[PDB]
Amino acid sequence: MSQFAADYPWLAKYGFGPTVKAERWNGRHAMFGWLAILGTGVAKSHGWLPSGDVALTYNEWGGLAQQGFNTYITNERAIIMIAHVHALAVSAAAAFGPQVLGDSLTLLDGEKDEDPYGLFVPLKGTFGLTPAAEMANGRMAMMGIIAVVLTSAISGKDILEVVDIGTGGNLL
Amino acid sequence: VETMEGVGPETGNKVFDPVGFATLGGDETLAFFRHAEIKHGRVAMAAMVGFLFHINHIHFPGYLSPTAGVTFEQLSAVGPFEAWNRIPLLGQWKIFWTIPGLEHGSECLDPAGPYTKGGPPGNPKFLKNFWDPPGFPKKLIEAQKGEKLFSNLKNGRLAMIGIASVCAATAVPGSVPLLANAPALTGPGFALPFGTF
Amino acid sequence: APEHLQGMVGNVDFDPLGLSSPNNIKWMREAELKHGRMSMLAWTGYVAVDLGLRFPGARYAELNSFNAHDVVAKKELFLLLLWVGTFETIGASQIYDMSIDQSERKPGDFGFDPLRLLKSPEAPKYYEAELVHGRAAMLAFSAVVTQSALGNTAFPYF
Amino acid sequence: KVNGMVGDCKPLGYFDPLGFSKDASPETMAKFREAELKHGRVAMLACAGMITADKFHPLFGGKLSSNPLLAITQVPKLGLLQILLFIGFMEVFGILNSRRPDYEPGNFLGTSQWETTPTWDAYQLRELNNGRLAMFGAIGMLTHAYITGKGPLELL
Amino acid sequence: SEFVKPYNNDPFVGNLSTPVTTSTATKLYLGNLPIYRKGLSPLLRGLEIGMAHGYFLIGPFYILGPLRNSPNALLVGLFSAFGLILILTLGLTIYGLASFQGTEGGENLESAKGWRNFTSGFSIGAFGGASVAYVLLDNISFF
Amino acid sequence: SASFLPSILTPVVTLVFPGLMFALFFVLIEQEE
Ligand code: CLA
Ligand code: CLA
Ligand code: CLA
Ligand SMILES: CCCCCC(=O)OC\C(C=C=C1C(C)(C)C[C@H](OC(C)=O)C[C@@]1(C)O)=C/C=C/C(C)=C/C=C/C=C(C)/C=C/C=C(\C)C(=O)C[C@@]12O[C@]1(C)C[C@@H](O)CC2(C)C
Numbered sequence: 061m062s063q064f065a066a067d068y069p070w071l072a073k074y075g076f077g078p079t080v081k082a083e084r085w086n087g088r089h090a091m092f093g094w095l096a097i098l099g100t101g102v103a104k105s106h107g108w109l110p111s112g113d114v115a116l117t118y119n120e121w122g123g124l125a126q127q128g129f130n131t132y133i134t135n136e137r138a139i140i141m142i143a144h145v146h147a148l149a150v151s152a153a154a155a156f157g158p159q160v161l162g163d164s165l166t167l168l169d170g171e172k173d174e175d176p177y178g179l180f181v182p183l184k185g186t187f188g189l190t191p192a193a194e195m196a197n198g199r200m201a202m203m204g205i206i207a208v209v210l211t212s213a214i215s216g217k218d219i220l221e222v223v224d225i226g227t228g229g230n231l232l
Numbered sequence: 233v234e235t236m237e238g239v240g241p242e243t244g245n246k247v248f249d250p251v252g253f254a255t256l257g258g259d260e261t262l263a264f265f266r267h268a269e270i271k272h273g274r275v276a277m278a279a280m281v282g283f284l285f286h287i288n289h290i291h292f293p294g295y296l297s298p299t300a301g302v303t304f305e306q307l308s309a310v311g312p313f314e315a316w317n318r319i320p321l322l323g324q325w326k327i328f329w330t331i332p333g334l335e336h337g338s339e340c341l342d343p344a345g346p347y348t349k350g351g352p353p354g355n356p357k358f359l360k361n362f363w364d365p366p367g368f369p370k371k372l373i374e375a376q377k378g379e380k381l382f383s384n385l386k387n388g389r390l391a392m393i394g395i396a397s398v399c400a401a402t403a404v405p406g407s408v409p410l411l412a413n414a415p416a417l418t419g420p421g422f423a424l425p426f427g428t429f
Numbered sequence: 430a431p432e433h434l435q436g437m438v439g440n441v442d443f444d445p446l447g448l449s450s451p452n453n454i455k456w457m458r459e460a461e462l463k464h465g466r467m468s469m470l471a472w473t474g475y476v477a478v479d480l481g482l483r484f485p486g487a488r489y490a491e492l493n494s495f496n497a498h499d500v501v502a503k504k505e506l507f508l509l510l511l512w513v514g515t516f517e518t519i520g521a522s523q524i525y526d527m528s529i530d531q532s533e534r535k536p537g538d539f540g541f542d543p544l545r546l547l548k549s550p551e552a553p554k555y556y557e558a559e560l561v562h563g564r565a566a567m568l569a570f571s572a573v574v575t576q577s578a579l580g581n582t583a584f585p586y587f
Numbered sequence: 588k589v590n591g592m593v594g595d596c597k598p599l600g601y602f603d604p605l606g607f608s609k610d611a612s613p614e615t616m617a618k619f620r621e622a623e624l625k626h627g628r629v630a631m632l633a634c635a636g637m638i639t640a641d642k643f644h645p646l647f648g649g650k651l652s653s654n655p656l657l658a659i660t661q662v663p664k665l666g667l668l669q670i671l672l673f674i675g676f677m678e679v680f681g682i683l684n685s686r687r688p689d690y691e692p693g694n695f696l697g698t699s700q701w702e703t704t705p706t707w708d709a710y711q712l713r714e715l716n717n718g719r720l721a722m723f724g725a726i727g728m729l730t731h732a733y734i735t736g737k738g739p740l741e742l743l
Numbered sequence: 744s745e746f747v748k749p750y751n752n753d754p755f756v757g758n759l760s761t762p763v764t765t766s767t768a769t770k771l772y773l774g775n776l777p778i779y780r781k782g783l784s785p786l787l788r789g790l791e792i793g794m795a796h797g798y799f800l801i802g803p804f805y806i807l808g809p810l811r812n813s814p815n816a817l818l819v820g821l822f823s824a825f826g827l828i829l830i831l832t833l834g835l836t837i838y839g840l841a842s843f844q845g846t847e848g849g850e851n852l853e854s855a856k857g858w859r860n861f862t863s864g865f866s867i868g869a870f871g872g873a874s875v876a877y878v879l880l881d882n883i884s885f886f
Numbered sequence: 887s888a889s890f891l892p893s894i895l896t897p898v899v900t901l902v903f904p905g906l907m908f909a910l911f912f913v914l915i916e917q918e919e
């Protein structure tokens with residue numbers, strides 16, 4: 061807090077660093093990415109459209125074809141990458157656009173960061189579209205991402221399929 | 233205000249107004265409605281004279297664009313509203329580009345302003361000698377031309393009714409009883425600009 | 430009665446989910462009015478095309494409103510896209526100016542009153558008639574498209 | 588120079604028969620001078636264009652020389668729209684010049700701020716006389732191209 | 744005559760009143776552009792600059808890029824225009840940070856609030872102009 | 887699978903990191919007392 065405010069005054073002026081704004085935004089991103097992980101699980105389940113066995117040739121994608129160890133980049137990774145790039149373009153338009161209908165990514169001119177604190181953020185009495193409940197949901201989503209990453213790394217299974225243990229028959 | 237003109241006999245000497253319309257807005261809305269009524273009337277009377285010329289096979293003794301090959305003779309061979317579909321493709325452009333020029337001038341270049349705010353509706357007399365290239369009204373008194381304007385409005389309404397009847401009879405057979413069947417009045421019943429679009 | 434931001438045309442204080450901040454009220458009204466106007470035009474066009482009105486020509490005939498979108502997209506809907514975007518650009522100017530500052534420009538008031546019908550004594554009734562018709566037409570067009578998507582297109586969509 | 592306006596050439600002087608400029612407001616004079624100068628400039632462009640495009644037309648290849656055929660045989664609709672957009676931009680700037688309270692009529696350079704000599708009036712008269720000549724020449728060129736079907740450097 | 748005179752009636756300022764600097768045509772052009780037009784908030788100035796610039800910037804990447812002879816030429820050009828627009832937006836933000844510090848704000852462009860509004864308008868306008876020119880370029884056979 | 891790490895790290899590091907460092911360094915240059 062004040063340690064990071066004194067350590068990085070330029071960075072803590074604009075709300076960056078360990079602040080409540082950063083953690084709320086990261087929780088929202090974790091929620092949408094949980095939805096995206098579930099959607100990609102459905103994508104491998106149904107086989108809506110992308111196939112991940114064919115390759116990306118040089119003659120249609122340039123130097124963004126064969127890149128790692130002279131290894132082909134597949135159409136599934138390319139499709140998910142293109143979707144992520146479009147999400148990032150919408151993200152840049154929202155971050156550097158007019159601040160309408162939205163909490164700002166950064167802090168504006170001389171405004172203090174909010175503080176719904178944390179600890180346990182009482183669920184009863186804060187139901188609905190309240191900042192404390194959305195905050196709790198994003199915090200739980202970030203912890204779910206951390207737990208899924210650790211479980212997949214330990215078990216040696218796919219990140220999309222280590223959650224398939226905890227669903228049972230679901231999507232894929 | 234609904235004092236204006238067009239209220240006379242055969243309607244009770246009162247405003248014919250079942251639906252609101254006249255009270256849908258204010259004074260400027262009435263001026264716009266009167267300008268629309270007068271312009272609609274004049275267009276209908278002109279269309280009626282042109283349609284009567286077309287039925288009686290009164291065409292110009294010219295050629296109408298020798299490059300295309302269309303002549304005035306086979307523009308009268310076909311029925312009404314199909315002759316407009318055969319006026320090449322530059323002729324529709326020229327008839328049009330002439331008519332917006334008149335519309336833009338008739339609204340813009342008024343020393344008193346638009347008919348909604350200053351100036352009577354149906355008065356493009358600021359276009360010099362446009363209404364009267366000869367004199368015709370040049371010695372007529374004001375009391376005469378007021379009655380003539382009233383006759384203008386009545387004949388315009390009648391011509392609107394008549395051209396609607398002609399379009400309906402050319403479109404839906406048996407709509408007009410006196411028209412019934414006819415040798416002419418055979419065609420699409422409507423004319424799109426530039427033929428198809 | 431949710432907050433004090435309400436109190437305008439078509440207000441019955443209906444906000445159960447509470448999606449109305451002090452800032453997001455003018456944008457909410459502008460979005461509702463834009464959706465309502467586009468839905469009135471959309472429902473009228475869908476019904477009128479399915480009722481029998483056709484563009485004169487062999488291409489635009491034999492087509493219902495459901496299977497019209499993938500036929501005229503590259504040729505006829507492009508002109509509508511150009512004109513709608515042309516109007517929406519100046520609309521964007523006015524809307525953004527209203528959003529940041531400019532203490533006039535009530536949401537929906539684009540100034541498009543050419544006939545000057547607001548000079549009538551029934552102007553507030555025109556306001557609530559517009560809003561009620563916009564809500565009814567959003568519901569009506571959503572109904573029409575979701576019913577016609579489930580097989581039975583016809584005219585009556587049931 | 589009569590009434591503050593250049594003109595009045597030697598072969599025929601203040602050329603106002605029919606009384607178009609008798610007892611007329613200076614606004615009417617400004618409108619008439621704007622019309623005359625814009626006609627002259629458009630007609631100089633037209634005359635030079637037909638003369639050059641009769642014998643030197645490299646922009647699209649073989650493109651004929653009958654001037655009404657030139658505008659329709661090619662020049663795709665985007666090109667005509669771009670020409671119209673350019674001309675509309677210049678006409679909007681003409682309107683904005685006409686609204687200014689220093690409006691010399693055919694003047695986009697705004698020469699009222701700088702000092703002027705009779706040589707400036709002589710050059711303005713040169714522009715006006717060349718403009719009028721090109722007015723007549725452009726009408727004649729279009730008439731020949733319709734009657735015969737050949738351009739200006741053709742027909743000879 | 745003399746068409747080159749001291750600039751703004753001051754003979755010792757480092758400028759001249761040539762027919763390029765002080766013509767009425769140049770004043771009408773450079774007094775009605777978005778950065779100079781009267782009665783414009785900084786956001787609208789940035790928006791009107793941005794749409795033209797984005798249209799422009801998606802111009803050269805599609806035709807001359809490394810993937811020009813590819814079925815994905817227009818998409819790659821759009822993405823390259825998006826990246827250049829993001830770089831220009833970052834440059835505008837860091838210029839505003841370095842230039843306008845401890846300012847009062849307001850509708851003036853030379854302030855923190857004004858430059859933030861200008862940068863936001865430029866970014867959203869540039870992304871929109873690139874997208875619009877993508878849409879027009881994908882259906883270029885319409886014209 | 888270690889065939890992704892070049893294509894991930896090399897653009898991130900080589901492009902994104904010095905661009906942010908140039909922007910941050912320029913801002914730190916031009917801040918005054
Ligand atoms: C339409 C173009 C046009 C216009 C608007 C003007 C306008 C003007 N001229 Mg001008 N002029 C023109 C063409 C034009 N000229 C041409 C072509 C010539 C060469 C013969 C001249 C030669 C000329 C001289 C030598 C002088 C002027 C002067 C003037 C100014 C005052 C006279 C006046 O009131 O005229 C008003 C003019 C009009 C209202 C235009 C009338 C257009 C009619 C309707 C044309 C009718 C047809 C026509 C007779 C023949 C054309 C058809 C033919 C191709 C077959 C005024 C600004 C005087 C001046 O500058 O004073 C300082 C002066 O001394 N003019
Ligand atoms: C060493 C780091 C590095 C890397 C990884 C790249 C990567 C790339 N360069 Mg590049 N370049 C670099 C340094 C680098 N450059 C330097 C130092 C110079 C100057 C000498 C250039 C000059 C250069 C030119 C002149 C061109 C490239 C092109 C390309 C692209 C190759 C063509 C292709 O397949 O994609 C095709 C491109 C796409 C599919 C678009 C991808 C969208 C963008 C790039 C992603 C967004 C990135 C984001 C904005 C980064 C933010 C940075 C900011 C935070 C500081 C690729 C994106 C070509 C290119 O971009 O094609 C138009 C091209 O024409 N480069
Ligand atoms: C100073 C030593 C050094 C140098 C010059 C390089 C150089 C390179 N490494 Mg690398 N690397 C190093 C140490 C070094 N490595 C160490 C110790 C590790 C183990 C963690 C790695 C792990 C590593 C991976 C996994 C990958 C590279 C890759 C690369 C290449 C692309 C650049 C890049 O993305 O790096 C990214 C490197 C890192 C994120 C690791 C940090 C590197 C060291 C620890 C930092 C040393 C800083 C050095 C002292 C300079 C200080 C001044 C500086 C701030 C200006 C490039 C040839 C990529 C490759 O193979 O491309 C073909 C790639 O995918 N490196
Ligand atoms: C056309 C633009 C006109 C500009 C505007 C204008 O001047 O307005 C005047 C105007 C109307 C009007 C108005 C007034 C009522 C009069 C006044 C109003 O005043 C106000 C303020 O209200 C304004 C307005 C606009 O309402 C209309 C002017 C129309 C004009 C000047 C029309 C030229 C056609 C020439 C043709 C068709 C040539 C065909 C040539 C063709 C089709 C060929 O085949 C040539 C050919 O070579 C080809 C290709 C191959 C060769 O082998 C064979 C030949 C040699 C045969």
Ligand SMILES: CC1=C(C#C/C(C)=C/C=C/C(C)=C/C=C/C=C(C)/C=C/C=C(C)/C=C/[C@@]23O[C@]2(C)C[C@@H](O)CC3(C)C)C(C)(C)C[C@H](O)C1
Nearest residue numbers: 085086087088089090091092093094096097202203205206
């Ligand atoms: C208290 C204290 C100490 C401490 C501590 C501790 C324990 C600190 C722990 C911090 C911790 C544990 C921080 C986790 C963050 C997780 C994040 C940010 C996840 C983001 C995930 C996001 C934003 C979502 C990303 C994606 O959605 C995207 C964008 C697309 C999807 O396709 C993929 C996914 C879903 C992944 C010390 C060490 C003792 C020293 C000192 O005393 C101070």
